[PDB]
């Protein structure tokens, strides 16, 4: 049970366990953020904002560690963080219709783990019009059978996110900006 999240997500919560995440710096406020949109009832999806390179995907491993070191409220305390592979999705598919049916069995298998999941969807708009999963994702969101983190640029967003409602209206806007150059430098060993 659970295939399509095995073979198509990669559990960043585990990597989280197994030690194999660099530290984040200076995302204190993003990633409290993003925690506090998650709680919510409604419109409890945020949406990273930034240009690329910007270091989104990185908050969303912070996420990750605090959930795995109890650095969170308690409801969130257990959840487990799937970012999307886009690559593993891809790989041997060769058809549209292949690699739809994949994701189908993704949001299938989400629904059965409702409230147990978060997963992260890098540059959602390429799902949402940017190859539209949205059919499928939006029912999804407003069911609560997927609760989500995505990352996009301001742009992408108001463009793909904000002029359709089903999506907006599930969606929060997050804003990342470029770290510092002593944060970004901290990384290395
Ligand atoms: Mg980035």
Do not use: W
Not at 134 to 149: D, F, I, T
Request: glycine share 10%.
């Amino acid at each position: 049970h659970m295939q399509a999240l095995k073979k198509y997500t990669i559990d960043l919560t585990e990597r989280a366990e197994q030690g194999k995440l660099d530290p984040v710096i200076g995302r204190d406020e993003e990633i409290r953020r993003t925690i506090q949109v998650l709680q919510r009832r409604t419109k409890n999806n945020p949406v990273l904002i930034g240009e690329p390179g910007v270091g989104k995907t990185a908050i969303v491993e912070g996420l990750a560690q605090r959930i795995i070191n109890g650095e969170v409220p308690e409801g969130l305390k257990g959840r487990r963080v799937l970012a999307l592979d886009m690559g593993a999705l891809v790989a041997g598919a060769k058809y549209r219709g292949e690699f739809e049916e994949r994701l189908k069995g993704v949001l299938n298998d989400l629904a059965k783990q409702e409230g147990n999941v978060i997963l992260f969807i890098d540059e959602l708009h390429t799902m949402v019009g940017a190859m539209d999963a949205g059919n499928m994702l939006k029912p999804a969101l407003a069911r609560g059978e997927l609760h989500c983190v995505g990352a996009t640029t301001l742009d992408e967003y108001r463009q793909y996110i904000e002029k359709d409602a089903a999506l907006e209206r599930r969606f929060q806007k997050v804003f990342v900006a470029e770290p510092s150059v002593e944060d970004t430098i901290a990384i290395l060993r």
